[PDB]
Ligand binder design. Structure first.
Ligand code: GDP
Ligand code: BEF
Ligand code: K
Ligand code: MG
Length: 308
């Protein structure tokens, strides 16, 4: 009876790159909004909804690494941003911290979304160390501003990409690995909303776990065979790309999807993996979906919050 509206908003260059790559991948039932100062980059956006901010400040250029210009640009386009958001039940704001537009405009966009009634999740990167300390300090201020503006925040330090590449992995391939954090989080929530579970979770449960909750982890794991449930649960909670690990989580939304063979025993095994990894007394909202078209694969979705 309730069908939640999810939007993904890219802010600045890195955020709009993420939006374009997610659209290429193919999302469905998610709406995308592209926000930038940089008219050149914005012109190449694949997003249905595009908002050029700050044209009077920048003349259609980017913000030249000045976050105050990104912030003013967003504020002066508040009404256009409100209009594009209106109706969203959930908004993901994605941005690369450290430049001028994401750093300054992304917290404004998040504040607007939350004031408009949307559950508001930020997924942002910190710069590579090779970009230098000024970029890092500027990024840190953006992260802090994002935390103040969102319901929950996922931070991806770009330095962690250096942990998952070999000497030849293309830069674009590494970037797609960072994108997956947002894409699979969005997809997991979309699927949770769309499908009726045997133990049914819904958007009210997402809100309980994510509303006004600080740092977050969103993870998906898929596995087959023996120890599938343990293996899928470990994959869901163990991304090498995250600033915030599962350790310390006090609230967890966990959904297990499997075929008719999904056993009670393996459901407990998977839940225990998350409980034990948290190393906390976690408040868990547990769900299950039986998809008969699944044979031997199991999918574990985890949203974790409450680090404190
Ligand atoms: N992982 C990733 N990081 C990016 C990407 N584009 C930019 N960055 C990072 O994001 C930071 C800000 O860059 P950018 O978004 O282009 O600046 P802005 O347009 O002024 O918001 C950079 O310092 C990089 O660390 C991307 O596509 N993927
Ligand atoms: F390119 Be960002 F606007 F500094
Ligand atoms: K559901
Ligand atoms: Mg730019």
């Amino acid at each position: 009876s309730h069908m939640a509206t999810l939007k993904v908003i890219g802010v600045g260059g890195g955020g709009n790159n993420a939006v374009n790559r997610m659209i290429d991948h193919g999302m469905n039932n998610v709406e995308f909004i592209a926000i930038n100062t940089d008219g050149q980059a914005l012109n190449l956006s694949k997003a249905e909804s595009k908002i050029q901010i700050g044209e009077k400040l920048t003349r259609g250029l980017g913000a030249g690494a000045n976050p105050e210009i990104g912030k003013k640009a967003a504020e002066e386009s508040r009404e256009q941003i409100e209009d594009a958001i209106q109706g969203a039940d959930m908004v993901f704001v994605t941005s690369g911290m450290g430049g001028g537009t994401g750093t300054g405009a992304a917290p404004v966009v998040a504040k607007i979304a939350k004031e408009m009634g949307a559950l508001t999740v930020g997924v942002v990167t910190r710069p590579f160390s090779f970009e230098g300390r000024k970029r890092q300090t500027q990024a840190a201020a953006g992260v802090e501003a994002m935390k103040a503006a969102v319901d929950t925040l996922i931070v991806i330090p770009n330095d962690r990409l250096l942990d998952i590449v070999d000497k030849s992995t293309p830069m674009m391939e590494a970037f797609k690995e960072a994108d997956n954090v947002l894409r699979q989080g969005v997809q997991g929530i979309s699927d949770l909303i769309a499908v009726s579970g045997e133990v049914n979770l819904d958007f009210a449960d997402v809100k309980t776990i994510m509303s006004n909750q600080g740092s977050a982890l969103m993870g998906i794991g898929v596995s087959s065979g023996e120890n599938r449930a343990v293996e899928a649960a470990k994959k869901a909670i163990s991304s090498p790309l995250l600033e915030t690990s599962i350790v310390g989580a006090q609230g967890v939304l966990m959904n297990i999807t499997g075929g008719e063979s999904l056993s009670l025993f393996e459901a407990q095994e998977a839940a225990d993996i998350v409980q034990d990894a948290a190393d906390e007394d976690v408040n868990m909202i547990f769900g299950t979906v039986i998809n008969p078209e699944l044979q031997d694969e199991i999918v574990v979705t985890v949203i974790a919050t409450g680090f404190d």
